[PDB]
Amino acid sequence: MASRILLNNGAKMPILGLGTWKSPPGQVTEAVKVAIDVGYRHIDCAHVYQNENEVGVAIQEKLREQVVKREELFIVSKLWCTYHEKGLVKGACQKTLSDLKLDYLDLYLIHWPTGFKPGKEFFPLDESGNVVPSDTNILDTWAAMEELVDEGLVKAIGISNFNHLQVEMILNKPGLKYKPAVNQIECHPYLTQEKLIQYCQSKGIVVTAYSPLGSPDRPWAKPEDPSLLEDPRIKAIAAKHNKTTAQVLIRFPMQRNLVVIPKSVTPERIAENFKVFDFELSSQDMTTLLSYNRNWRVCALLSCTSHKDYPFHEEF
Ligand SMILES: NC(=O)c1ccc[n+]([C@@H]2O[C@H](COP(=O)([O-])OP(=O)(O)OC[C@H]3O[C@@H](n4cnc5c(N)ncnc54)[C@H](OP(=O)(O)O)[C@@H]3O)[C@@H](O)[C@H]2O)c1
Numbered sequence: 001m002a003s004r005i006l007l008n009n010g011a012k013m014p015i016l017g018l019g020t021w022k023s024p025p026g027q028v029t030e031a032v033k034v035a036i037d038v039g040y041r042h043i044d045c046a047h048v049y050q051n052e053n054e055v056g057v058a059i060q061e062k063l064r065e066q067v068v069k070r071e072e073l074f075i076v077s078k079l080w081c082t083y084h085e086k087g088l089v090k091g092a093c094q095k096t097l098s099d100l101k102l103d104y105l106d107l108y109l110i111h112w113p114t115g116f117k118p119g120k121e122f123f124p125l126d127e128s129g130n131v132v133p134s135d136t137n138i139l140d141t142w143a144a145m146e147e148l149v150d151e152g153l154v155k156a157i158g159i160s161n162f163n164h165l166q167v168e169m170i171l172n173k174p175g176l177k178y179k180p181a182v183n184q185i186e187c188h189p190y191l192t193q194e195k196l197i198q199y200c201q202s203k204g205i206v207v208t209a210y211s212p213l214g215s216p217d218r219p220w221a222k223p224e225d226p227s228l229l230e231d232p233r234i235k236a237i238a239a240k241h242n243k244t245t246a247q248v249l250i251r252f253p254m255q256r257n258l259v260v261i262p263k264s265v266t267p268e269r270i271a272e273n274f275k276v277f278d279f280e281l282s283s284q285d286m287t288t289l290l291s292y293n294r295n296w297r298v299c300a301l302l303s304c305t306s307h308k309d310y311p312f313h314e315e316f
């Protein structure tokens with residue numbers, strides 16, 4: 001119903017945002033422009049997506065056009081794994097700010113709990129293909145994130161792909177100054193995340209659901225993989241409500257008090273995906289969608305499975 005959710009930093013965050021991972025650099029400027037024109041006020045970004053400059057061109061044009069005011073936008077980015085060291089965090093944030101052509105971010109996330117060796121490569125590997133870790137722990141990285149708030153570069157800080165023990169580690173940090181505002185995690189009917197969501201919500205941490213449509217454009221997709229958009233059970237719920245399957249998949253997390261960030265570069269779908277504030281899934285619909293859980297996780301890497309902070313060995 002309401003378009004924004006209150007964060008534990010006192011700011012309001014739009015519950016629907018536009019995802020930008022895999023949005024080609026030659027298409028994402030127009031995608032973000034269209035999104036803002038049709039009502040989006042939250043854009044999910046990351047340095048590792050390699051398209052923040054182009055996202056920034058769109059944001060700047062719409063600000064210049066006075067289609068929107070800066071205070072009305074909620075721009076999110078993420079600290080990549082090769083910048084977990086305390087001496088690199090500010091520069092990483094500043095590069096993102098410069099690319100997005102902003103003087104602050106609304107929310108800055110630790111992208112993954114796994115720190116990697118700094119350098120040009122986003123995934124530094126040893127000769128056998130294991131990622132090369134950094135020895136910097138999540139608590140010291142968190143302290144560096146807190147400094148960004150105190151310097152005015154970001155309004156809120158949070159985490160992404162943290163399991164419950166990792167969230168707990170932050171919450172139990174000696175001398176914790178700012179709690180994480182958000183944990184952004186994969187969540188959809190095949191990976192419903194009940195345990196981790198309940199834990200985060202119980203601590204006042206807002207959960208953002210990524211890959212809500214199952215990321216059908218993920219580069220490692222296989223033909224035999226399950227497909228949310230094609231699941232006849234979900235299509236049936238959509239048909240009953242006279243909505244598209246994507247619209248049901250977006251409304252689902254909204255009714256769990258989650259923020260959701262579907263990605264599209266297709267103008268018609270960008271508009272479609274925003275038309276989700278005028279219908280309600282029943283309790284029965286919600287429980288039925290939850291029943292489709294199969295613990296099917298699309299976003300994880302074999303190269304990281306021995307990293308000490310790999311998040312997905314733990315149940316949740
Ligand atoms: N924190 C993290 O580690 C993390 C990880 C993954 C994702 N994310 C964030 O979450 C965002 C969303 O996740 P995602 O990109 O993995 O996948 P997604 O939003 O689940 O799915 C995107 C795919 O769905 C298609 N699509 C969109 N709307 C549609 C509609 N109405 N009908 C049919 N197909 C539709 C898109 O096609 P077209 O674009 O061609 O229209 C694209 O192929 C990402 O872009 C990123 O911002 C964060």
Ligand SMILES: O=C(O)COc1cc(F)ccc1C(=O)NCc1cccc([N+](=O)[O-])c1
Nearest residue numbers: 021048049081112114299300301304310311
């Ligand atoms: O991480 C995201 O937001 C989406 O996925 C990616 C986007 C990119 F632009 C580049 C890489 C990825 C990707 O492989 N992301 C997956 C990933 C990253 C880091 C650590 C782990 N891990 O399992 O520990 C997994």
